[PDB]
Write a protein that holds these residues in place. Structure first.
Motif, PDB file in Angstrom:
ATOM      1  N   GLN B 235       0.807  -1.206   0.000  1.00 52.90           N
ATOM      2  CA  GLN B 235       0.000   0.000   0.000  1.00 52.90           C
ATOM      3  C   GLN B 235       0.848   1.268   0.000  1.00 52.90           C
ATOM      4  N   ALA B 236       2.096   1.194  -0.473  1.00 54.38           N
ATOM      5  CA  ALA B 236       2.938   2.377  -0.558  1.00 54.38           C
ATOM      6  C   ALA B 236       3.620   2.553  -1.912  1.00 54.38           C
ATOM      7  N   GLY B 237       3.420   1.642  -2.866  1.00 58.51           N
ATOM      8  CA  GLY B 237       4.083   1.751  -4.155  1.00 58.51           C
ATOM      9  C   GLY B 237       5.555   1.418  -4.129  1.00 58.51           C
ATOM     10  N   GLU B 238       6.029   0.807  -3.041  1.00 53.54           N
ATOM     11  CA  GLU B 238       7.428   0.478  -2.821  1.00 53.54           C
ATOM     12  C   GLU B 238       7.622  -1.029  -2.900  1.00 53.54           C
ATOM     13  N   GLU B 239       8.808  -1.434  -3.335  1.00 57.33           N
ATOM     14  CA  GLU B 239       9.130  -2.836  -3.560  1.00 57.33           C
ATOM     15  C   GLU B 239       9.614  -3.537  -2.294  1.00 57.33           C
ATOM     16  N   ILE B 240       9.806  -4.848  -2.410  1.00 53.98           N
ATOM     17  CA  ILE B 240      10.335  -5.677  -1.333  1.00 53.98           C
ATOM     18  C   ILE B 240      11.848  -5.614  -1.410  1.00 53.98           C
ATOM     19  N   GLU B 241      12.468  -4.950  -0.442  1.00 58.17           N
ATOM     20  CA  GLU B 241      13.925  -4.950  -0.308  1.00 58.17           C
ATOM     21  C   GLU B 241      14.361  -6.230   0.388  1.00 58.17           C
ATOM     22  N   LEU B 242      15.213  -7.010  -0.274  1.00 58.15           N
ATOM     23  CA  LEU B 242      15.756  -8.205   0.353  1.00 58.15           C
ATOM     24  C   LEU B 242      16.542  -7.853   1.618  1.00 58.15           C
ATOM     25  N   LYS B 243      17.323  -6.766   1.571  1.00 58.92           N
ATOM     26  CA  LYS B 243      18.133  -6.375   2.723  1.00 58.92           C
ATOM     27  C   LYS B 243      17.248  -5.934   3.894  1.00 58.92           C
ATOM     28  N   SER B 244      16.356  -4.956   3.668  1.00 63.02           N
ATOM     29  CA  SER B 244      15.456  -4.493   4.730  1.00 63.02           C
ATOM     30  C   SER B 244      14.709  -5.661   5.356  1.00 63.02           C
ATOM     31  N   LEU B 245      14.266  -6.596   4.526  1.00 57.14           N
ATOM     32  CA  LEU B 245      13.642  -7.813   5.024  1.00 57.14           C
ATOM     33  C   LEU B 245      14.552  -8.569   5.982  1.00 57.14           C
ATOM     34  N   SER B 246      15.860  -8.530   5.746  1.00 53.99           N
ATOM     35  CA  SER B 246      16.731  -9.351   6.571  1.00 53.99           C
ATOM     36  C   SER B 246      16.933  -8.724   7.957  1.00 53.99           C
ATOM     37  N   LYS B 247      17.051  -7.384   8.051  1.00 50.82           N
ATOM     38  CA  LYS B 247      17.276  -6.764   9.361  1.00 50.82           C
ATOM     39  C   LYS B 247      16.127  -7.055  10.320  1.00 50.82           C
TER      40      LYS B 247
END
Lengths: 335, 335
Positions: B235-247
């Protein structure tokens, strides 16, 4: 086409600040030009698909007795499209967040019924294209998504006084508030409720397969017959005939069904639209609680899906292979 | 605004009979007028919401090497909006039921990325209104529902050669056929599939809460954490960051998650969109078989709704009061 445009008028409302809905009353009744034709023609198709509401006016109907004299040939259509359009702003200017827009008044007859259409078209804007790479800004009309609309059934209003339908308008999709915008705009009571009659259909069908004292095979097929009929009217723009319903249903009880609701005096009229949400319960189910939602064909009663009412426990055999593939993932790979 | 329009062109295709898509090549690159601004601005917002597809060109890319030279300053934009627009008809005139319409070519830069937009707008028609009750017929553009559209990511195409994204376009809602209309129109391979990566997300999350060797509380919360992250990107028009997902996920296994998919070599790139159908299975379920369809929150595992896998039998305690009211009608009044 197969429709005739008696009279046609056009007036504009515009907002300067918030409650400044200046009126733009037309120096003349717009003529029944050719460009009006396909416009109003598209209006009548679209309304005749959309769900509606029903009621009749009031003794104090502050717009009825202004028309009850217009139909006698006393007030001009312009003179009436003037007094109608002005008293429109006075019923919308209590909503500040109100865009500008036009107020259509097509009087027309169509296949033995004479109608008077009232359409307030939200006015949109986009980029007209003329011939040669000269992209201009233009305006057009909200003709596919105009949800502020009503039409009076003139001919059954001047003939049947006690009818409760000659007064129809669209209800809001989320809110039942556009309904209240129109009812105070006319002075109309809630009469014929569409849900009220479909809901009122099944409480007499169960009382019919329970006088007959039938079983699952015979009783469900009655309910299924009722659905096969109703839904084929739903995808045809045609209403539920109480009589037609009785023939395909007569020879269940020896007595007809309309008599079975008239001597029991059940207050269902001759016709009514088919509310799809009410009419699935014949053959299709659903439920909503705790994020959980189900739906299924009712011939699973006793065959796949079981319920013990004391414990309110729902038993299911043979999950859909779609979901069955999902659950292999939480438990198999799961210890 | 915050966008700049490098170059802009406009060409028209019209049909005379069926396969007669006469071309209407523009004597000049349409200038970057002001009226173009808010048009192309609305195009970029709408695309940037819609789902897309991804891939890279081919060695035989019959349009790439015509642009691989245009970007060097050899072919004019008009000279390139000419050769592109002509070879468009030759890829659409194999569909006879093809309306006429315009072919937009907006070259523009926007926030460090330079884009080249290609938009074929279905051309609609409706009733313009000028000042004084002179209802005219006009044309406008399909700007809210134009589903024949693509845009190349120029800046990451001229910098990353091995990227598989710089080539994006809309997929058809029902059919994966508008995808094939574009791929032969460009000469692009299916590369990065959005479903391919989300589907590929969970098969490594289960392999992560199974090295950790956790329980329902800890393992579901990992799956729930993954959802709380993904949906707030959706709901923000932003993608899935693999890195952000990891933190937000590191300190589960001592080793990070991106390393856990790179030393296992799982072929998930740095970013990818969030496929909502794939990503509910973390916390929400469903199924389809025999007309029966369910859906529910996965924290009902073991608490309300039970399953014995041998017998594929689904046990449910405490039906929704919505449905619970329905079943009182088939059985109570039922003998």
């Amino acid at each position: 086409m197969s429709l005739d445009i008696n009279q046609i008028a056009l007036h504009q409302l515009i907002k300067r600040d918030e409650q400044n809905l200046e009126l733009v009353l037309r120096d003349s009744l717009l003529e029944p030009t050719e460009t009006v034709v396909e416009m109003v023609a598209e209006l009548h198709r679209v309304y005749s698909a959309k769900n509606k509401a029903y009621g009749l006016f009031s003794e104090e109907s502050e717009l009825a007795q202004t028309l009850r004299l217009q139909r006698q040939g006393e007030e001009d259509f312009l003179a009436f499209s003037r007094a109608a359009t002005g008293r429109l702003r006075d019923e919308l200017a209590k909503y500040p967040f109100a865009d500008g827009g036009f107020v259509l008044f097509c009087h027309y007859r169509y296949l033995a019924v004479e109608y008077l259409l009232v359409a307030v078209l939200s006015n949109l804007s986009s980029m007209r294209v003329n011939e040669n790479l000269d992209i201009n800004p233009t305006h057009y009309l909200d003709i596919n998504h105009a949800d502020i609309v009503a039409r009076i059934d003139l001919t059954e209003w001047e003939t049947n006084p006690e009818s409760t339908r000659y007064l129809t308008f669209l209800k809001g999709r989320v809110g039942r508030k556009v309904a209240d915008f129109f009812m105070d705009f006319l002075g109309a009571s809630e009469g014929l409720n569409a849900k009220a009659q479909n809901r009122g259909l099944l409480q007499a069908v169960d009382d019919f397969t329970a006088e007959a004292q039938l079983d699952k095979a015979e009783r469900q097929n009655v309910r299924q017959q009722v659905y096969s009929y109703c839904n084929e009217q739903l995808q045809a723009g045609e209403e539920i005939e109480l009589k037609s319903l009785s023939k395909e249903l007569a020879g269940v009880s020896e007595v007809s069904f309309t008599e079975f609701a008239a001597e029991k005096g059940y207050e269902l009229e001759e016709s009514f639209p088919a509310d799809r949400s009410t009419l699935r319960q014949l053959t299709k189910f659903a439920g909503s609680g705790g994020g959980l939602t189900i739906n299924f064909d009712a011939m699973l009663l006793g065959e796949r899906i079981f319920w013990d009412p004391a414990t309110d426990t729902l038993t299911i055999k043979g999950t859909p292979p779609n979901l069955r593939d999902q659950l292999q993932r939480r438990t198999s790979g799961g210890n």
